Amino acid sequence: TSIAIGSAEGFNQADKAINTAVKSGRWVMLKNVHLAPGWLMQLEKKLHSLQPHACFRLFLTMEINPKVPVNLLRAGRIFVFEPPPGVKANMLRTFSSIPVSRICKSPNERARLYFLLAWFHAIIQERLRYAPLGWSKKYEFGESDLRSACDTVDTWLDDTAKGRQNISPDKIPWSALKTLMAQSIYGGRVDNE
Amino acid sequence: MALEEFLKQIREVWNTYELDLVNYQNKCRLIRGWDDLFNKVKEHINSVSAMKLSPYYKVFEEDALSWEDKLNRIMALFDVWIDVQRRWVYLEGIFTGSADIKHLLPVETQRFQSISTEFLALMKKVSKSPLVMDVLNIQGVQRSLERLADLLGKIQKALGEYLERERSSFPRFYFVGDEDLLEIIGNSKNVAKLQKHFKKMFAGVSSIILNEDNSVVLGISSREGEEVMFKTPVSITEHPKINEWLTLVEKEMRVTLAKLLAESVTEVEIFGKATSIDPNTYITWIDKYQAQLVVLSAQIAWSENVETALSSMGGGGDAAPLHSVLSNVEVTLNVLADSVLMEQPPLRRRKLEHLITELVHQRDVTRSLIKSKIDNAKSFEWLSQMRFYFDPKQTDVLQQLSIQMANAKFNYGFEYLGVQDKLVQTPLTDRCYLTMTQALEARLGGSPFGPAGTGKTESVKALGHQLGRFVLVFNCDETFDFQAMGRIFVGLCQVGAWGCFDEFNRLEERMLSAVSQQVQCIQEALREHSNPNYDKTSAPITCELLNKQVKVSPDMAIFITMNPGYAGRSNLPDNLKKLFRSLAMTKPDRQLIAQVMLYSQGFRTAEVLANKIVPFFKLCDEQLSSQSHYDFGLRALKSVLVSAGNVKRERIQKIKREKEERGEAVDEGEIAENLPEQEILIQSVCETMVPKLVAEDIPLLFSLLSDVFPGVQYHRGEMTALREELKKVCQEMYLTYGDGEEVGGMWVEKVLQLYQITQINHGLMMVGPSGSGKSMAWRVLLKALERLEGVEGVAHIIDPKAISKDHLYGTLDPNTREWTDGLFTHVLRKIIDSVRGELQKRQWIVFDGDVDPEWVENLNSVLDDNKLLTLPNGERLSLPPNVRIMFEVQDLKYATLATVSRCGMVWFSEDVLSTDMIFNNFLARLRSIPLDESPMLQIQRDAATIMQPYFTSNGLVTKALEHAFQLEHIMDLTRLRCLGSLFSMLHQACRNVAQYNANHPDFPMQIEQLERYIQRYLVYAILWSLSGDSRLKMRAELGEYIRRITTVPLPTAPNIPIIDYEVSISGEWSPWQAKVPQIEVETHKVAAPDVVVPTLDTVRHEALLYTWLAEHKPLVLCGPPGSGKTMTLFSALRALPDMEVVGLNFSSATTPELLLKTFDHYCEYRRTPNGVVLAPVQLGKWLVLFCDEINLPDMDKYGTQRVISFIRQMVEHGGFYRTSDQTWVKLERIQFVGACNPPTDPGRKPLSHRFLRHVPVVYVDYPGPASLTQIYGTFNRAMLRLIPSLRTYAEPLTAAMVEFYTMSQERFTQDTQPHYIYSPREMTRWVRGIFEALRPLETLPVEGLIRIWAHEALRLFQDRLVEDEERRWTDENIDTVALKHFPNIDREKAMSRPILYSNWLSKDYIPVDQEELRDYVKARLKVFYEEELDVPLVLFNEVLDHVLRIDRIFRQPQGHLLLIGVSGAGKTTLSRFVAWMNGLSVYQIKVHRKYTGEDFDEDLRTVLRRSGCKNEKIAFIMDESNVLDSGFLERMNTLLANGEVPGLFEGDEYATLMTQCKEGAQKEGLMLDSHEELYKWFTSQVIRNLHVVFTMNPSSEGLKDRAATSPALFNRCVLNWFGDWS
Amino acid sequence: KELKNIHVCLGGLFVPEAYITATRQYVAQANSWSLEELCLEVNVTTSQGATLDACSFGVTGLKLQGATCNNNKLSLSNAISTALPLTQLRWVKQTNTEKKASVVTLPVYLNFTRADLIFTVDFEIATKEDPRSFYERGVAVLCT
């Protein structure tokens, strides 16, 4: 059960979800909990005096906001999500996130296209570490763009290779992939000529 | 003669005019002819107004009053009858038409049945006597209607649950307000009244078409008059239910449009694939079909032609049939261009422009295909384009047309969009279409972002209109909470409509995160709708919205347009940004927009003009000075282009007309060829861009125009007919008028420029410094246009910052979800309804106040092309074409570019209104308007003649005003503040002469004496109006400058400044020192609160304040705390017996509610025919509101004070707005007086220049050592008369007091500690302290007097000290001062190391020994342990000192304590111990976790009742930890100062209080009766019985913060720094 | 007349974009050309040997990032910044002779933050350097 924190009745859903989960043993995720630091104090107190089910897991999503309660950080386990250190790490997370079945589909040329997408994503996202030179500003080139680009590759490759086991590299729609990424997927956030 | 004729016409009209009654569904006879009845009453009232003006009104005075009283009752009664009749009609239809409401709302039906039967009974009574006079005189009919309206109001609100049930039946009802929905449901039988509600339910359907019986829906219509005829008309008889036949209309609308498109496609295929096209045939096809179908048919034909051509080029060597497609497009484009060049009907002209705009795009795309050598239909250069495919073999007409872009497939919704302004298909828009369609295919949302004016809202709407979808625009803000957005999503999901949430990021960050849950689940439902496994036979797809299953239509989409870094915006959460595909719309292709727009308008040189106008706008942005009201973006370019089309159209008509008078010749080709297209574009630029330019930027723009358009000159058309109208209006308003370079010439051009902006823009801004002639500009133009065009002009002036945003726009109840209209919403909704013919008048809504994005961005959709006001409850209000939203501001520093780009600015520089223009207006008013309400007028006319030479350019006043600006003042100087004070003071000179004439009936004032008095007073008036807010030496400095430049005789004193001289009524300068006598105060009134020793500064300021107060003019006294601002004002008010003063103490948390509570307590609201009037309860006395901390209230982040803006509105406009019912309340007999420290003091904010203009400021400085010696030498001499032996020491005692105070003031300043404020108040407390000690003493040796003198110095100058070295310095210097001024005395007997005085060990206040005092305190503490508190204490030397200090304060009237020290030091225990010793009852608030403001109010009332009514002394002990809210301090701030809280006792509490004050007065022996003196006695008792002890920790920043949140804590409380134990 | 012959640092100007317009407006007025028809061409001069010719406007203080200008030809360099001695802004009529396939448009930013763009220059590549390499390496010109 996923609940976005921030509404008056959002807290009511969060309390009901946690009360039901600690007995059933399901998972509860509360997103943007940094927007209600005062309610986080009460959540920490409730969690401490609790004996939940073995399989119960509570996930809290925050923004690394200095207003997050200290006692909540001490009680929970902190996982920090950030750009990978380099190109090699960027490729590894890109390949790990994509299911193995998605890459291994009917055209054998899909794997190379995904690798090129993985490399292109790694290069432009690493250039963000050099703000004036790599780009003109800190663009939000993130996982959402990679998901859209991967969906674009899957849709267009299926359209051309209609069930063929192998496709000629010349028949791959390079113009479609290049234009869509430059205009819609990745070029949407770009505002500088 | 004619007077009798007017009376006869009124009588014969009213005894013969019968109310118009018609049958209404064979139930009753309703009243019609409302406009005829209302205007007849108004025109007769105006005749009664002219009845009074004529001199012969004397004999006819009695008859006119009887008629006017009759008319007002007729006007008031029928104003309510029209309301109750309308409410009854739609309420009756709801309860009668639907039989299911009998069970859901049984009690509500029963109440309405009784109301309806009573209403129908009144219909029978009025039907018997249709005459207006007979129905008016019905017994209690007026009261019977007020209850009827209230009863209809109560039943109206209770139907909210029924309305929400009905919205589910027809989902489009969700975008209709509750009141409008009631009208639609109730009036289902009378469809004729539904024609004004279709525009809120459909994209372009403004009304339906009905047959003669009004029982069959023949078709629909648009706003422009375009009509669509249903193939199978919908019959209402077989589907009586309103939602049933409305649904059939919507379903028939789509099918009819689909069928019409198929026929249109068949016809347009002939024009396609044709080398030659007949213009006559093409025009006929355009006229036959609808605007959206003509463009759609052209798009389909071109798409099929290119698809056929590309398929034919499969081989690659097919001789490129794409050239044939390009040839046909150009040939058809040639025909369209020719058709526009000639005169066409307005509807066909719009169709041609739409066809040109699209065919230009089709030509551009085909050229790209030709250039790129595309020979395959699967090439992405063709796939990326938007292609329309038509399938005539498709059985379902709704699925015949398929729109595709890249890999996205769409279906035309066939929503009737009417005729919309189609956009130019720029490459950026193509990029927008590609990205948004890709987002739609992935079932995501679209989030275009960028700067303002780039075209994101229009592009989203254009794409929706391209697919035939219902696009709804919502102007998002912070009140779009989870419930409001969920209800909107429910409506969009069920309807199947696009939602464009513009300014989405303006929501709160927490609310944006919450909304992300609803968008996520909606998109998940959409995503699983696109699965091919889905079957329509199964249950329709649903999403969990607002804890309810909501069906999701596939056509629904969500779009959010936002500005990333603009002020007033929030940051979207990351989980929400992943639900939208963002696109950067930053640089619009304005070059192509200009070319296509001018090409479609008929310009021959569109390419040349576009290549000249777009760079001109870029150069203007890069060259002109950076001003806050400058916008050279696409909106400015769009406004120029549309004006160019309008200028050309009217120029062509004028040329065509001109040929008619000359003769007979009409040739479109010759007119088009001989047309100055260069001049037309420059005219539009000058009519739109010149008004906003500052003085130094105008030559830069004209130089740019000359360079870009060389050899082309513009001469503005002389609006002659308007200029006489302005000249006549200006003369009646005493306003100077000028032509060109004449005096007032610049102002008139601004008025004409503002007139042109009104004609072009529906949203205006008047940006310019305070007092630059802005209000007079639009006031004169509104009146001039009323005379010129004959259309009545009504202006609704609103101050947006004087009220909260909830009261300005409306609020949505979190619990009941009921929408309450705000100020602006009520005004706009009233005009839209036009119940009383508001739509037939020129309505202007003027926002007279500051502009910041918090409130002004809610008008983003109103000022945009939408012309729509969107509310959080889903209701939208279209701005009527006759309504102009106008802003009158002084700057645009805090306004974002989103609003600056939306309005046409008119810049009013301060040089527009020259000084002599104000001088002429003053003298014109003086010569015409009598001051009393003629001998008084004759004095004014004679005085004006004397002041004429001085009130000229380069005259005495103008030269003096110029010099006064060089000198610095306590407040920022403005021209109109000096002139406004000067004019009000010269009026008093005229009143002084009139008083002299009444005092000397036999010998009136002569001309020669009048010249002497007025000339001398004018010099006196200039000095005190220009340097009144400046220090003493610059009051002098302006004196010599006047002496150097004036010819008026001046005092011949070698060194005495002119500011020390007054003007006697005899016409001679006389010193102010002659009115300062060496008075002898009585002994019992020594240092009394109301005793004022007259000094030079006091008499000068008292006369100045009396002059301003006698004119009922607002004023502010500025000066250091304790300088004597309050004392001087109250002393001046004692000379005015008809003025009562009410004290208000402002703080950093002061809001207009504090003023409103005072108005409720001291004034009353009364209904008058002219409107609501707020006047004091007591008759004939003027109420004066004394605001003591006027500049303390906090400025928000946008630099405005809400209370100051409230006062500025309520001073300039003479009234405010009552937010209870959104009615204008006009003040009567209410005056405002302010006091404040200089703005350079910490915590003080400078007052707004638009407020200081109306308010003169006088600077009250600290008395000098000479003044202090005179003031307190008088007190010491009178006080020392108690002991005749000590009378010789009065002079040295005063010198010692002044000397020590001077050094203590210099040594300890606010820089060291915030509370180190030393004022003459300490000297007054010094005199009082010595007086009370000596009073009892029968005799005292000089040593005893010095010991008392030193003790008072220690208790006043050392108690507040913090550091030990400061206390050591005070101890040492007191010894030196006493020895310096009192030699040869026993220093040891006087300046002993411990100085303690107490009345505990004797009847008198004599010095006490430390050892003997300790034994007494030890003995009393032992008793204190068993009785009250058994906490052991330890007595050291500091405790004995501290208990004596607390005892001294507890014995004083209004004696409050401020104990500062570390916790655990005994501050509370010592306070309780001393209070028990002095008999006080200790009260502490038992604060807990759930303690709130209401609990504190109850505790405050409990203490006040005990200490005010029961005469019980109470030591209210309060700690800083008990302050859980700023509300606690605000109540304490007022209670400490005034001894009362105005809004504390209300309703039953006030009634219970008044009984208790009455009984308590009986015990005291006074039988007070009225509530006024009961409260005055109650306030006096609380003052003398309530002591408040405030304890807080010695914080650094907290003490400074408390110095502003609660100023009374440092001015009314005696501060003692306990600190830590040394 | 001297106001045309003074070398001005665009970094030291309060608004440098207004200076570019002023030079554009001066050339159009003197030669009786239209403002929109003018185009800007760049000529980096070694020291100040070259002289203004009624259309040139010397500009100093321009810094070239990641490239070196020799004989008005660019070559990629490993230095962080390269100072241009004297940049001559010549306003000429547009000839629409298309690109030379060795001309790259360098942005001219006001400062190192690369937040605001003043104008764009069309320099020429020397030798066999790839124009795409200039784009990838973020080569630009800074006013200060």
Ligand SMILES: Nc1ncnc2c1ncn2[C@@H]1O[C@H](COP(=O)(O)OP(=O)(O)OP(=O)(O)O)[C@@H](O)[C@H]1O
């Ligand atoms: N054309 C005119 N001729 C003569 N006097 C004028 C004229 N226009 C304005 N005034 C006077 O000059 C003063 C300017 O007041 P006005 O209301 O026009 O200023 P404003 O720009 O609206 O000021 P604010 O910003 O304070 O609202 C007033 O005293 C007004 O009577």
Ligand SMILES: Nc1ncnc2c1ncn2[C@@H]1O[C@H](COP(=O)(O)OP(=O)(O)O)[C@@H](O)[C@H]1O
């Ligand atoms: N001419 C005077 N005669 C008598 N008392 C004076 C005179 N001038 C100043 N004072 C003393 O100065 C004090 C002024 O305090 P007040 O006017 O209340 O300060 P504020 O104007 O800042 O509220 C009074 O208590 C008064 O005793």
Ligand SMILES: Nc1ncnc2c1ncn2[C@@H]1O[C@H](COP(=O)(O)OP(=O)(O)O)[C@@H](O)[C@H]1O
């Ligand atoms: N002079 C004193 N001798 C002994 N104990 C004291 C003395 N003054 C305060 N206390 C102690 O402080 C406690 C009360 O503190 P309190 O006066 O409430 O602190 P505060 O002055 O900060 O409100 C008592 O329990 C008492 O024991």
Ligand SMILES: [Mg+2]
């Ligand atoms: Mg917008």
Ligand SMILES: [Mg+2]
């Ligand atoms: Mg005004």
